[PDB]
Design a binder for this molecule. Structure first.
Ligand SMILES: CCCCCCCCCCCCCC(=O)CSCCNC(=O)CCNC(=O)[C@H](O)C(C)(C)COP(=O)(O)OP(=O)(O)OC[C@H]1O[C@@H](n2cnc3c(N)ncnc32)[C@H](O)[C@@H]1OP(=O)(O)O
Ligand SMILES: COc1cccc(CC(=N)NC(=O)c2ccc(Cl)cc2OC2CCNCC2)c1
Ligand SMILES: [Cl-]
Ligand SMILES: [Mg+2]
Length: 385
C-alpha cells in the first residue's frame, strides 16, 4: 500500500482521476540519446542473461522457471503451466526483439532464477495509436521473493524498451498496482464437470448431485454456424478485415497488421485455435481461444487442468450468444476441461445464458507512462496472454 517503487514511476497515484479529454503521456519529449547505456546492477552473484527463445534449450530453461514459479490461484491449488511452444509463439511475434527477452542467472549454479519479457505492438487508447511494449512473464524464483528483484527486472526492461524510442507499455496483473485503466472479472464455463469437481475447481450441493451437475453442463455436439472451420493461410486478409473493423469500437485495443494477424491467429495445436466462417470467399464470423494449462498442485489423481481462454470472437451472421455457444463446443471438441473468459468486449452479456460461473478475482489492465480516463471492462478490446 506504500508503493515505494511504483510511486517513483510515471504511473498515476492511487487517487489520480482524469477527465475523458485527457489522453497523453505522464512524461513527454523523451530522448533516446539520454537513455542509460549501462545494465541495472544486480545483487552479487547474479547476472543478466539474454535468452534465445528460438533455441530449444534456452526456451526449456524459461519453461522450467515458469512451471515451478509462475502465477498460482488465490488458494495455491493450481499454477499456470504455459507450454514451451506457447512461449515461442508469445515471444516471437512480428518485429520482436531478442534483447527484450531478459533472464537473470545465479552465477554459481548457472541456473535461471528470474525472467521478464516484452514484445512491440501498436495499441490504440481512446482513439490514439501509440507504439508500446506489451510486458509479460515477469517471474522471480520462489526462493528469492521479496528481495526487490522485481523492480530491477522492470527498470532494466524499461531501459531496453526506451532504447528503441518506445515510452509506453501495456500489461496486466491480478494484483492491484497504481493504477488500473480497467478492471475485468473472469468467468469460467465448465466442460468436464466431474473432473473440475474432483480437483476442487467446482463444487456440488444437495440441490446439485453429481448426475445433475453433469446434465446441467451438457452441450449438443452440433455447431450453430455449420461451416465454422480451422483458419488457414488464405483467411488471413479476411480475418484482418473482420477483426480490425470490429476492434475500432473499443477504448483500448491492438492495431493488427496482416503480419500480426497471421502470427496471432494461424492455428497451432495446443497453443492457439482460430475458426472461421467463410461465405463467398469472405470471412463473416471468427472464434479464437488459446490453450493455457494449469498444473494441479498435489491432487492424487490429476496432474493438469486443460483450459481454453477466450481470445477474439466476432460474428456478423449469428447472435453473439450462438457464436460463443459454438466457441464452447469447439473447445470441448479439443479436449478442454473449462472455457475461461473475461468480461471484456461483449462477453458479459452471454455469461448467464451460457452457464458461466463468476471466478474468484479479476484482471487489472495497466498502461505505463500514459494518463487517461479509466473505463468499464466492456470498453476493453484487447486480451493479453
Ligand atoms: C515504456 C516501457 C515500460 C516497460 C515496463 C512496464 C511495467 C511492467 C511491470 C511488470 C508487468 C508484469 C506483468 C506480468 O508478467 C503478468 S502479471 C504476473 C506476474 N508474475 C507473477 O505473479 C508470478 C509469481 N510471482 C513472482 O514471480 C513474484 O512475486 C514477482 C516477480 C511478481 C514479484 O516479485 P517479489 O519477489 O514478490 O517482489 P519484489 O522483488 O520484492 O518487488 C516488489 C515490488 O514489485 C511490485 N510488483 C509485484 N508484483 C508485480 C507485478 N505483477 N507487476 C508489476 N509490479 C509488481 C510490488 O508492487 C513491489 O513494488 P512496490 O513496493 O512499489 O509496491
Ligand atoms: C485455474 O488455474 C489458475 C492458475 C493460476 C491462477 C489462476 C487465477 C487467475 N489469476 N486467473 C486468471 O488470471 C485468468 C482467469 C481467467 C481468464 Cl479469462 C484470464 C486470466 O488471465 C489470463 C490473461 C493474463 N495472463 C494470465 C492468463 C487460476
Ligand atoms: Cl534506479
Ligand atoms: Mg525479489
Amino acid at each position: 500500500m506504500d508503493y515505494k517503487f511504483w510511486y517513483t514511476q510515471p504511473v498515476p497515484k492511487i487517487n489520480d482521476e482524469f477527465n475523458e479529454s485527457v489522453n497523453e503521456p505522464f512524461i513527454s519529449d523523451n530522448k533516446v540519446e539520454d537513455v542509460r547505456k549501462d545494465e541495472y546492477k544486480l545483487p552479487p552473484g547474479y547476472s543478466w542473461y539474454v535468452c534465445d527463445v528460438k533455441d530449444e534449450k534456452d526456451r526449456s530453461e524459461i519453461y522450467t522457471l515458469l512451471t515451478d514459479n509462475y502465477v498460482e490461484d488465490d488458494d495455491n491449488i493450481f499454477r499456470f503451466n504455459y507450454s514451451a511452444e506457447f512461449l515461442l509463439w508469445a515471444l516471437t511475434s512480428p518485429n520482436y526483439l531478442k534483447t527484450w527477452h531478459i533472464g537473470v542467472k545465479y552465477d554459481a549454479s548457472n541456473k535461471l532464477i528470474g525472467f521478464i519479457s516484452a514484445i512491440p505492438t501498436d495499441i490504440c487508447i481512446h482513439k490514439r495509436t501509440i507504439k508500446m511494449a506489451e510486458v509479460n512473464f515477469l517471474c522471480v524464483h520462489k526462493t528469492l521473493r521479496s528481495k526487490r528483484l522485481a523492480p530491477v527486472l522492470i527498470k532494466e526492461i524499461t531501459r531496453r524498451i526506451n532504447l528503441e524510442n518506445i515510452w509506453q507499455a501495456i500489461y496486466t496483473a491480478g494484483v492491484y498496482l497504481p493504477k488500473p485503466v480497467s478492471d475485468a472479472r473472469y468467468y469460467h464455463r465448465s466442460i468436464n464437470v466431474k473432473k473440475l469437481i474432483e480437483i476442487g475447481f467446482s463444487s456440488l450441493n444437495s440441490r446439485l448431485t453429481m448426475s445433475r451437475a453433469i446434465k446441467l453442463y451438457r452441450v449438443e455436439d452440433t455447431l450453430n454456424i455449420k461451416n465454422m472451420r480451422l483458419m488457414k493461410k488464405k483467411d488471413v486478409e479476411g480475418v484482418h478485415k473482420l477483426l480490425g473493423s470490429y476492434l475500432e469500437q473499443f477504448n483500448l485495443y491492438a492495431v493488427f497488421t496482416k503480419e500480426e494477424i497471421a502470427h496471432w491467429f494461424l492455428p497451432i495445436e495446443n497453443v492457439i485455435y482460430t475458426y472461421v466462417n467463410e461465405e463467398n470467399g469472405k470471412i463473416k464470423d471468427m472464434i479464437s481461444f488459446y490453450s493455457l494449462p494449469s498444473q494441479i498442485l498435489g491432487n492424487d489423481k490429476y496432474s493438469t487442468l486443460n483450459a481454453a481462454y477466450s481470445f477474439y470472437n466476432v460474428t456478423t451472421t449469428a447472435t453473439f450468444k450462438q457464436l460463443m455457444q459454438d466457441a464452447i463446443l469447439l473447445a470441448k471438441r479439443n479436449n478442454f476441461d473449462v472455457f475461461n473468459a473475461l468480461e471484456v468486449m461483449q462477453n458479459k452479456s452471454v455469461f448467464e445464458d451460457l452457464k458461466f460461473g463468476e471466478g474468484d478475482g479479476s484482471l487489472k489492465y495497466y498502461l505505463y507512462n500514459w494518463k487517461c480516463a479509466s473505463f468499464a471492462p466492456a470498453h476493453v478490446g484487447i486480451v493479453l496472454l
